[PDB]
Swiss-Prot record, chain A:
Main localization category: nucleus
Protein's name according to its UniProt entry: DNA replication complex GINS protein PSF2
Pfam families: PSF2_N (PF25005), Sld5 (PF05916)
Location within or outside the cell: Nucleus; Chromosome
Residues joined by cross-link Glycyl lysine isopeptide (Lys-Gly) (interchain with G-Cter in SUMO2): K109
Job of this protein: Required for correct functioning of the GINS complex, a complex that plays an essential role in the initiation of DNA replication, and progression of DNA replication forks. GINS complex is a core component of CDC45-MCM-GINS (CMG) helicase, the molecular machine that unwinds template DNA during replication, and around which the replisome is built.
Coiled-coil blocks: none
Keywords from the UniProt entry: Acetylation, Chromosome, DNA replication, Isopeptide bond, Nucleus, Phosphoprotein, Ubl conjugation
GO cellular component, one term: CMG complex
GO biological process: DNA replication; double-strand break repair via break-induced replication
From Swiss-Prot, chain B:
Protein origin, superkingdom: Eukaryota
Localization in the cell: Nucleus; Chromosome
Subunit annotation: Component of the MCM2-7 complex. The complex forms a toroidal hexameric ring with the proposed subunit order MCM2-MCM6-MCM4-MCM7-MCM3-MCM5. Component of the CMG helicase complex, a hexameric ring of related MCM2-7 subunits stabilized by CDC45 and the tetrameric GINS complex. Associated with the replication-specific DNA polymerase alpha. Interacts with MCMBP. Interacts with ANKRD17. Interacts with MCM3AP isoform MCM3AP; this interaction leads to MCM3 acetylation.
First-to-last residue of the parent protein present: 11 to 126 of 808
PTM annotation, UniProt: Acetylated by MCM3AP. O-glycosylated (O-GlcNAcylated), in a cell cycle-dependent manner.
Other information: Early fractionation of eukaryotic MCM proteins yielded a variety of dimeric, trimeric and tetrameric complexes with unclear biological significance. The MCM2-7 hexamer is the proposed physiological active complex.
Protein name listed in UniProt: DNA replication licensing factor MCM3
Originating species: Homo sapiens
General function of this protein: Acts as a component of the MCM2-7 complex (MCM complex) which is the replicative helicase essential for 'once per cell cycle' DNA replication initiation and elongation in eukaryotic cells. Core component of CDC45-MCM-GINS (CMG) helicase, the molecular machine that unwinds template DNA during replication, and around which the replisome is built.
Family: Belongs to the MCM family.
Curated annotation (Swiss-Prot), chain D:
SUPFAM superfamilies: GINS helical bundle-like (SSF158573), PriA/YqbF domain (SSF160059)
Lineage of origin: Eukaryota, Metazoa, Chordata, Craniata, Vertebrata
Family: Belongs to the GINS4/SLD5 family.
Gene name linked to the record: GINS4
CC per GO annotation: CMG complex; cytoplasm; GINS complex; nucleoplasm; nucleus
This protein's record includes keyword DNA-binding: no
Segments for region (Important for GINS complex assembly): 146-203
Protein name: DNA replication complex GINS protein SLD5
Alphabetized UniProt keyword annotations: Acetylation, Chromosome, Cytoplasm, DNA replication, Nucleus, Phosphoprotein
Subcellular location field: Nucleus; Chromosome; Cytoplasm
Protein induction: Significantly up-regulated in aggressive melanomas.
Organism: Homo sapiens
Function (record text): Required for correct functioning of the GINS complex, a complex that plays an essential role in the initiation of DNA replication, and progression of DNA replication forks. GINS complex is a core component of CDC45-MCM-GINS (CMG) helicase, the molecular machine that unwinds template DNA during replication, and around which the replisome is built.
First-listed, main subcellular location of the protein, grouped into a coarse class: nucleus
One GO BP: DNA-templated DNA replication
Subunit annotation: Component of the GINS complex which is a heterotetramer of GINS1, GINS2, GINS3 and GINS4. Forms a stable subcomplex with GINS1. GINS complex interacts with DNA primase in vitro. Component of the CMG helicase complex, a hexameric ring of related MCM2-7 subunits stabilized by CDC45 and the tetrameric GINS complex.
Swiss-Prot record, chain E:
Summary of the tissues where the protein is detected: Widely expressed, highest levels are found in adult testis and thymus and in fetal liver.
Classification lineage: Eukaryota, Metazoa, Chordata, Craniata, Vertebrata
Assembly and interaction partners: Component of the CMG helicase complex, a hexameric ring of related MCM2-7 subunits stabilized by CDC45 and the tetrameric GINS complex. Associated with ORC2. Interacts with HELB.
Keyword Nucleotide-binding tagged: no
Domain of life: Eukaryota
GO terms for MF: chromatin binding; DNA replication origin binding; single-stranded DNA binding
Protein family per UniProt: Belongs to the CDC45 family.
Name under which the protein is recorded: Cell division control protein 45 homolog
Gene giving rise to this polypeptide: CDC45
Subcellular location: Nucleus; Chromosome
Role noted for this protein: Required for initiation of chromosomal DNA replication. Core component of CDC45-MCM-GINS (CMG) helicase, the molecular machine that unwinds template DNA during replication, and around which the replisome is built.
UniProt entry keywords in alphabetical sequence: Cell cycle, Chromosome, Disease variant, DNA replication, Dwarfism, Nucleus, Phosphoprotein
One CC-aspect GO term: centrosome
Main location class: nucleus
Effect seen on changing A15V: In MGORS7; decreased protein level
Length: 176, 130, 196, 203, 283, 194, 82
C-alpha cells in the first residue's frame, strides 16, 4: 500500500456536521443519509463532510475522543505502558490531519490537539522499532502486534517483511 | 585496503571477582584443545614476562567478557594480569616468584578499534585500540 | 571463458534500471547466434567422432561445450524477454498510441507483439460489464474531488467534450474540467494539475 | 446481500489481493453484481439530471466505488502476466469441486498472452538455433510464486491449534492460538487456507 | 529590508531629503540622530534589530518627521498573519506581485510571467511571494539610480507647455524599464522627485512626457504622459487625445496597442515630427 | 511503477532463469582443480593436465561437477575461508561488502551446492553477518531525509541496497503525504525521459 | 524575549537551551531499543540570516555578545581532549 490509500480507507469514518442547505434523504449504495435540515446536526462519512466544507456548505464538529483533556491522559498512558495500548479510533492520524487542516477554526484548541496526537504517534513508532528488532535479534518466527493501526503498519511494513524474507531464506538454506 | 587484523586475513594459509575467575577458566584451556597450556609452559621454558592472547578466542569462549575487556581495558587488564600470575603459580611456584609481575599482550581482530592516529578521537578513552 | 558477447547484451540493460527502453541490438544478437552455430558444429563433429574410433576421453570436451551453449541461450532469451517487460509498461503509462521517439527503438517484430497485446487487453476490458465494460486503464489514484483545474503545457489540436463541445488548448491557459477526462492527458505531459 | 454489504466485502476482497503473494480465489459473483449498481445508478442520474446537488453526491460515490473495483482488477492482471504458465497449468488440472483462480475471461486473456509470447520468441532467437534447442519449456523459466513470505494479518474468527514452524527442525515447532480481532506477523504458508475461508484478512 | 535601505528608496523620503545630492544627504543622518537610532542598528535587517528600539518606532518616526516638513508619514492599510513567522503589509504583496509580472529577463511568450504572478497569490505558494520580494527590492534600488541620473544631469527639458525627458542605452539598468508597463511608475516617481527639486514656479506645475527606446530593430521608442503633479491632483490624464491628434496631424506611424491610451510606440525617426506638432497642438 | 523486473532467487535452492541479477552474479570467477585431462580445449588456459588450478565462472562449474568429483574439485575463495569468517564475527558493521562482492549473500548461497565439508559453517557466517548489519540499515534508511545518501550506501551489496531503497521509498512517501503533496496527479514515466 | 537574551547573555542561556534539547530528545526517541539506554548530550548549534560584522568592527563593547563574522581559515590545530 501507500499513504494515499490508507487515507482513502480512513474517509469512511463517521463525523457530525451542521449543514446550511435544504436536502431530502439520499440513498447511497453504502447506506442512507439525511435529511439535511438547515441548522441541525447530521452524521455523514468524512469524504462528504470535507467536500461540503470546501464548498462552504457546512460546519464541522470535533469528535468526542478529540478532547484536550482525555488526550492528555492517553499521552501519559502510552508512555507508561510497555505494549501497544488501544487508541480512540483505528485511523486517528488521518482524522486529526484532515479535520485540523480543513476545519481548524471550528475546532477549539486545534494546536494542542495536534501536538498531543503527534506525541502519541512519536511513541507508538518507537515501540515498533524495538518490537521489530528483538524479532530479528532473536530470530523469532511469530510476533503478536496488539493494537497497531493500519498506518503504523504501513509506514514500515514493506521494509520489515522484505527483510524477514531474506532472513528465512538464509536460515533454511542447509536442509537439502 | 583495510587492515582489520594483525594477521593478514587474505592469505594466512600459504565485582572484580567475576573477571578474575573467568580469565582463569579461560586460561585453563586444557579440556578443549590445550592451546594456552601449551603457551604458558612455552614461555616458562624461555623466561618471558608476558604472553600474547587472541581475543578471537575470548569471543568464542565468552562474548560478554570479550566485550567488557575492549571497553574498560584498565579494570580488566588489572584482573587479567592477576589471574595469570595465579595460573603460573599453578605450574611452577618457584618461577612464579622470580618475576615481580607478569604482563599480557593482545592480538586478534577488534571490531571498530582498528584506528589510525587520525581517527583516534576522544570516544576511545580507556579502550583497547590498535 | 566463452560467452563474452552475450554478456555485453545484459551488462547494458543492467545499466538502465529505471525502465527506459533502449535501442535494439541486432548486431550482438547475430554475433552470439553465430557462436552458437560454430560451437554446435565443432562439438557435434567430435560427438559422432567419439562413436567412430572410441575417443571417450573427449567426453569432457562435450560438457564444456554442451553447457557452454545453454548459457548463450539463457543470456539471449532473458534479454529478449526483459525487453518485453519495458514495452508492456508503455501501455499502462503512456496510452494506446506511442510517439515515434519510442516506436523507433523497438525491433520491427516487437510492434506485432505490442499490437497483439494491446488488442487482447482491449478485448478483455470490454468484456467485464454489459455496456462496453469498464476501462481499467484510467483511475490510477484515489479520487479526491469531482472537478480538477488543469493548465496546458503544449499545443494540442482540439480536445473533445463528450457533448460535442470542443475546447482549444493553447499554451499557458487553464481550464476547469472534470477529472474524468483529464487523467489521460495529465499522465502523459500535456496538461498539468495546478490547484493541488 | 444488501447492496450496502457488497462494498464492505469488496474492500476486503481488495486488500487481500494487494498483499497476498499468489493469485487468490476468483469472485465472479461480486465483480458481476457491482457492475449492476454502477450500471443502474448511472441511469437514474442521466434521466433525473435536473437537480444540481444530488447528482454530485451520487457521482462522487460512484467514482469511489469504480476505483476500488478497477484497482482490484488491475491488481490481478499483474499476477496473471507474471505467472502465466503456472496459472494455466493449475487451471487445466483442477479437481472438480474447487473454486477456480481464473475468471472465464481472464482465462482467455491468459491463453492469448501465452500464445502471443511463444509466437514471439519463436521468430527472433529460438528459430536460428541448432535444431535441438529450439524448444524451451516455460515451467522452468518463469519463477513460481513465493509462498514463504511474511504477512501482517488480523483475524476475525477465533482459531486455535495453529502450527508455527520457525525452521527445518520439526521439534522446534510450538503451536499457537489466535484471539478475535488480534493481529500477527506470520508466514503466508501456514495460514493459506484461512484467507480462502474468510477467517482472516491480510492487513 | 533594513530601516536604512528603505528610507533611501521610498520615493517620498528620497525626494524631501533630496537623497541624491551630498549636500542634503546629511539630512538623513540628522534625522536618524534625532531619534537615538545607532548607525549600526539602522543598517541591519529589521527583523534582527534589537528589541529595545522598536517599541514605539512608528511614533518617534512620525514625530521627528514634523521637524523636517513631512507630515503625511502615517497611512491607513491592513496586514495579515498566517502562522508563526508570516506577517505581510498590504503594500508588500503588491510590490512583489507587480514585480513578478514585470521581470526584465524574458523566458518565453508574453503570458509566461502572468502565470507565475497569478500563482503567488494563494497561500500554498509562499515560495514565490518570498521570491518576488527580491525582485521588488532589486527594482527599487535600480530606480533611485536613474532619478539620480536625470537630476544630477538635468535631462528634464522644459519644451514649453510640458516637461520632457529621454533615456540612453549606455546608462546601466535602462533595459529593465523597456516594458511599456513598468515605465509609467518610473515617470510618476520622476515627477515627484523633480517637482520637489526644481527652484522654478512654472515647472512645478507642468505635466511630464517621457520616451525611452523600445525596439532597436524596428527602431522605435515608447512614450507616456502623466498629469500635472500636486498634492491633491484629481488624477484625470489627458494625453490619450493629444497623442492621437498629433499622430493624425503629422501622419506618422503610431500604435495604441494597450488598453490605456497614454502609452504609444513610435518610430525613432518620427520623434521630432510628432513632438513639434504636439507642442503646437497642446499650445 | 509498472515495470516489474524478474527478482532474484539467488538465496534459495536455485537461481531463476530470466533474472538479470543472477545472470551477472554467477559470472563471477571461482577456483577449481581438474581431475582429468582436458583434450581438444587446452587453448584457453591441445590438452590440460590433471591436478591443475584454474579459474572458471560459477555457471560453468555447475554441470562440470558431480558427487565423485569426476572432472574437477572446488575450493572456496578466501572471502569465505576460515580467515575472514572471524573478521565478520568481530564486528560486521565495518566490512566493505561492496569490494568483497558485489554479491556476497548471493554468491555464498550457491557455494552450498558443492557439498564441501564446512557448509555447516558458511550458512552460519551469512546468517550471523546479516543479523549483525541489520540495525544499521533499519536506522540509516528510515532516518536519512533529503540528504546525500551516496555515502550511507557505499559499503553495501545488491541484497542490501535493495532494502536501503525500500526504506527510503517509504520515508519519502510518508513525508510527501504529511505535506499535502501526494494529492497532485503527475506524469509517471515521461518525467524519466525529461 | 528568548531570542534577545540569547543575543545578550549567550553563555548562561545556551546551557538552558542544550539542557532542554536533552529533555525533548528523551520523550521522542524512547524506548531506546537495547544497546543504548543512557541518554546522550545534544550539541545545539545555531545559524542565522543576519548581516555579518567584520573583525575590524569588534569593539570591546561586544564582549560576550553573539557576533557573526566572515573570514578565511588559515590554520588548524590538532584535536585534543578537554
Amino acid at each position: 500500500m501507500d499513504a494515499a490509500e490508507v487515507e482513502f480507507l480512513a474517509e469512511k469514518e463517521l463525523v457530525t456536521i451542521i449543514p446550511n442547505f435544504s436536502l431530502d434523504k439520499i440513498y447511497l449504495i453504502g447506506g442512507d443519509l439525511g435529511p439535511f435540515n438547515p441548522g441541525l446536526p447530521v452524521e455523514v462519512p468524512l469524504w462528504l463532510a470535507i467536500n461540503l466544507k470546501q464548498r462552504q456548505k457546512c460546519r464541522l464538529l470535533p469528535p468526542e475522543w478529540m478532547d484536550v483533556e482525555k488526550l492528555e491522559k492517553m499521552r501519559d498512558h502510552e508512555r507508561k505502558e510497555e505494549t501497544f495500548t488501544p487508541m480512540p479510533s483505528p485511523y486517528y492520524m488521518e482524522l486529526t490531519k484532515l479535520l485540523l487542516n480543513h476545519a481548524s477554526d471550528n475546532i477549539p484548541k486545534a494546536d494542542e490537539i495536534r501536538t498531543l496526537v503527534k506525541d502519541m504517534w512519536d511513541t507508538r513508532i518507537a515501540k515498533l522499532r524495538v518490537s521489530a528488532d528483538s524479532f530479528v535479534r532473536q530470530q523469532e518466527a511469530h510476533a503478536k502486534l496488539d493494537n497497531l493501526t493500519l498506518m503504523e503498519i504501513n509506514t514500515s511494513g514493506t521494509f520489515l517483511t522484505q527483510a524477514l524474507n531474506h532472513m528465512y531464506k538464509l536460515r533454511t538454506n542447509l536442509q537439502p | 585496503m583495510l587492515p582489520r587484523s594483525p594477521p593478514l586475513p587474505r592469505g594466512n594459509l600459504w565485582e572484580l571477582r567475576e573477571a578474575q575467575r573467568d580469565y582463569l577458566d579461560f586460561l585453563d584451556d586444557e579440556e578443549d584443545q590445550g592451546i594456552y597450556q601449551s603457551k604458558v609452559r612455552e614461555l616458562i621454558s624461555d623466561n618471558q614476562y608476558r604472553l600474547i592472547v587472541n581475543v578471537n578466542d575470548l569471543r568464542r569462549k565468552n562474548e560478554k567478557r570479550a566485550n567488557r575487556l575492549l571497553n574498560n581495558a584498565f579494570e580488566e587488564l588489572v584482573a587479567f594480569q592477576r589471574a595469570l600470575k595465579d595460573f603460573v603459580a599453578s605450574i611452577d611456584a618457584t618461577y612464579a616468584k622470580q618475576y615481580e609481575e607478569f604482563y599480557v599482550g593482545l592480538e586478534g581482530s577488534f571490531g571498530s578499534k582498528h584506528v589510525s592516529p587520525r581517527t583516534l578521537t576522544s570516544c576511545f578513552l580507556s579502550c583497547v585500540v590498535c | 571463458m566463452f560467452c563474452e558477447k552475450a554478456m555485453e547484451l545484459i551488462r547494458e540493460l543492467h545499466r538502465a534500471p529505471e525502465g527506459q527502453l533502449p535501442a535494439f541490438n541486432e548486431d550482438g544478437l547475430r554475433q552470439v547466434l553465430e557462436e552458437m552455430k560454430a560451437l554446435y558444429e565443432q562439438n557435434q563433429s567430435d560427438v559422432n567422432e567419439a562413436k567412430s574410433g572410441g575417443r571417450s576421453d573427449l567426453i569432457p570436451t562435450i560438457k564444456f561445450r554442451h553447457c557452454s551453449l545453454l548459457r548463450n541461450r539463457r543470456c539471449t532469451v532473458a534479454y529478449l524477454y526483459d525487453r518485453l517487460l519495458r514495452i508492456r509498461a508503455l501501455r499502462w503509462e503512456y496510452g494506446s498510441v506511442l510517439p515515434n521517439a519510442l516506436r523507433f527503438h523497438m525491433a520491427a517484430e516487437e510492434m506485432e507483439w505490442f499490437n497483439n497485446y494491446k488488442r487482447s487487453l482491449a478485448t478483455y476490458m470490454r468484456s467485464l460489464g454489459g455496456d462496453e465494460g469498464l476501462d481499467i486503464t484510467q483511475d490510477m489514484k484515489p479520487p479526491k474531488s469531482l472537478y480538477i483545474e488543469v493548465r496546458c503545457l503544449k499545443d494540442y489540436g482540439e480536445f473533445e467534450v463528450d457533448d460535442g463541445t470542443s475546447v482549444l488548448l493553447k499554451k499557458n491557459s487553464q481550464h476547469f474540467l472534470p477529472r474524468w477526462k483529464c487523467e489521460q492527458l495529465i499522465r502523459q505531459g500535456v496538461l498539468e494539475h495546478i490547484l493541488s | 446481500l444488501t447492496p450496502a454489504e457488497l462494498i464492505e466485502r469488496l474492500e476486503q476482497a481488495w486488500m487481500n489481493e494487494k498483499f497476498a503473494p499468489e493469485l487468490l480465489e476468483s469472485k465472479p459473483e461480486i465483480v458481476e453484481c457491482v457492475m449492476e449498481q454502477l450500471e443502474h445508478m448511472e441511469e437514474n442520474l442521466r434521466r433525473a439530471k435536473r437537480e444540481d446537488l444530488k447528482v454530485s453526491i451520487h457521482q462522487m460515490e460512484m467514482e469511489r466505488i469504480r476505483y476500488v473495483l478497477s484497482s482490484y482488477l488491475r491488481c490481478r492482471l499483474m499476477k496473471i502476466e507474471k505467472f502465466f504458465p503456472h496459472v494455466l497449468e493449475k487451471e487445466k488440472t483442477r479437481p472438480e469441486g474447487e473454486p477456480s483462480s481464473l475468471s472465464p475471461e481472464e482465462l482467455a486473456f491468459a491463453r492469448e498472452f501465452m500464445a502471443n509470447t511463444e509466437s514471439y520468441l519463436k521468430n527472433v532467437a529460438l528459430k536460428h538455433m541448432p535444431p535441438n534447442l529450439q524448444k524451451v519449456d516455460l515451467f522452468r523459466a518463469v519463477p513460481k510464486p513465493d509462498l514463504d513470505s511474511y504477512v501482517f494479518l488480523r483475524v476475525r474468527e477465533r482459531q486455535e491449534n495453529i502450527l508455527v514452524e520457525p525452521d527445518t527442525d520439526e521439534q522446534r515447532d510450538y503451536v499457537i492460538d489466535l484471539e478475535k480481532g488480534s493481529q500477527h506477523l506470520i508466514r503466508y504458508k501456514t495460514i493459506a487456507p484461512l484467507v480462502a475461508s474468510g477467517a482472516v484478512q491480510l492487513i | 529590508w533594513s530601516l536604512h535601505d528603505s528610507l533611501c528608496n521610498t520615493s517620498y523620503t528620497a525626494a524631501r531629503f533630496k537623497l541624491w545630492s551630498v549636500h542634503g544627504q546629511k539630512r538623513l543622518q540628522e534625522f536618524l540622530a534625532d531619534m537615538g537610532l545607532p548607525l549600526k542598528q539602522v543598517k541591519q535587517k529589521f527583523q534582527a534589530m534589537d528589541i529595545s528600539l522598536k517599541e514605539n518606532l512608528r511614533e518617534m518616526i512620525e514625530q521627528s518627521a514634523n521637524k523636517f516638513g513631512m507630515k503625511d508619514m502615517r497611512v491607513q492599510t491592513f496586514s495579515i498573519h498566517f502562522g508563526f513567522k508570516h506577517k505581510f503589509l498590504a503594500s508588500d504583496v503588491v510590490f512583489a506581485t507587480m514585480s513578478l509580472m514585470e521581470s526584465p529577463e524574458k523566458d518565453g511568450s508574453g503570458t509566461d510571467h502572468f502565470i507565475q504572478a497569478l500563482d503567488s497569490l494563494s497561500r500554498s505558494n509562499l515560495d514565490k511571494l518570498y521570491h518576488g520580494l527580491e525582485l521588488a527590492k532589486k527594482q527599487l534600488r535600480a530606480t533611485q539610480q536613474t532619478i539620480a541620473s536625470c537630476l544630477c544631469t538635468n535631462l528634464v527639458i522644459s519644451q514649453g507647455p510640458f516637461l520632457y525627458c529621454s533615456l540612453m542605452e549606455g546608462t546601466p539598468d535602462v533595459m529593465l524599464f523597456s516594458r511599456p508597463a513598468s515605465l509609467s511608475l518610473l515617470s510618476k516617481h520622476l515627477l515627484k522627485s523633480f517637482v520637489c527639486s526644481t527652484k522654478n514656479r512654472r515647472c512645478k506645475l507642468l505635466p511630464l512626457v517621457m520616451a525611452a527606446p523600445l525596439s532597436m530593430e524596428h527602431g522605435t521608442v515608447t512614450v507616456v504622459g502623466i498629469p500635472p503633479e500636486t498634492d491633491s491632483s484629481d488624477r484625470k490624464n489627458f494625453f490619450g487625445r493629444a497623442f492621437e491628434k498629433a499622430a493624425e496631424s503629422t501622419s506618422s506611424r503610431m500604435l495604441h496597442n494597450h488598453f490605456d491610451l497614454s502609452v504609444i510606440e513610435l518610430k525613432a525617426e518620427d520623434r521630432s515630427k510628432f513632438l513639434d506638432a504636439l507642442i503646437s497642438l497642446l499650445s | 511503477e509498472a515495470y516489474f523486473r524478474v527478482e532474484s532467487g539467488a538465496l534459495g535452492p536455485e537461481e531463476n532463469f530470466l533474472s538479470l541479477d543472477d545472470i551477472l552474479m554467477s559470472h563471477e570467477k571461482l577456483p577449481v582443480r581438474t581431475e582429468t585431462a582436458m583434450p581438444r580445449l587446452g587453448a584457453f588456459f591441445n590438452a590440460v593436465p590433471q591436478g591443475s588450478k584454474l579459474e572458471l565462472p560459477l555457471w560453468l562449474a555447475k554441470g562440470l561437477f558431480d558427487n565423485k568429483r569426476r572432472i574437477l574439485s572446488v575450493e572456496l575463495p578466501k572471502i569465505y575461508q576460515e580467515g575472514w569468517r572471524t573478521v565478520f564475527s568481530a564486528d560486521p558493521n565495518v566490512v566493505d561488502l561492496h569490494k568483497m562482492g558485489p554479491h556476497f549473500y548471493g554468491f555464498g548461497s550457491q557455494l552450498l551446492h558443492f557439498d564441501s565439508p564446512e557448509n555447516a559453517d558458511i550458512s552460519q557466517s551469512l546468517l550471523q553477518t546479516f543479523i549483525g548489519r541489520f540495525r544499521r540499515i533499519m536506522d540509516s534508511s528510515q532516518n536519512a531525509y533529503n540528504e546525500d545518501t551516496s555515502a550511507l550506501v557505499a559499503r553495501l551489496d545488491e541484497m542490501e541496497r535493495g532494502l536501503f531503497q525500500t526504506g527510503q521509498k517509504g520515508l519519502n512517501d510518508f513525508q510527501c503525504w504529511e505535506k499535502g503533496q501526494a494529492s497532485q496527479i503527475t506524469a509517471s514515466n515521461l518525467v524519466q525521459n525529461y | 524575549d528568548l531570542a534577545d537574551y540569547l543575543y545578550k547573555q549567550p553563555a548562561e542561556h545556551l546551557q538552558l537551551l542544550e539542557e532542554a534539547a536533552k529533555e525533548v530528545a528523551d520523550e521522542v526517541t524512547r524506548p531506546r531499543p537495547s544497546g543504548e539506554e543512557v541518554l546522550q548530550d545534544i550539541q545545539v548549534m545555531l545559524k542565522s540570516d543576519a548581516s555579518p560584522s567584520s573583525i575590524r568592527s569588534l569593539k570591546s563593547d561586544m564582549m560576550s555578545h553573539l557576533v557573526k563574522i566572515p573570514g578565511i581559515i588559515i590554520a588548524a590545530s590538532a584535536v585534543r581532549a578537554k
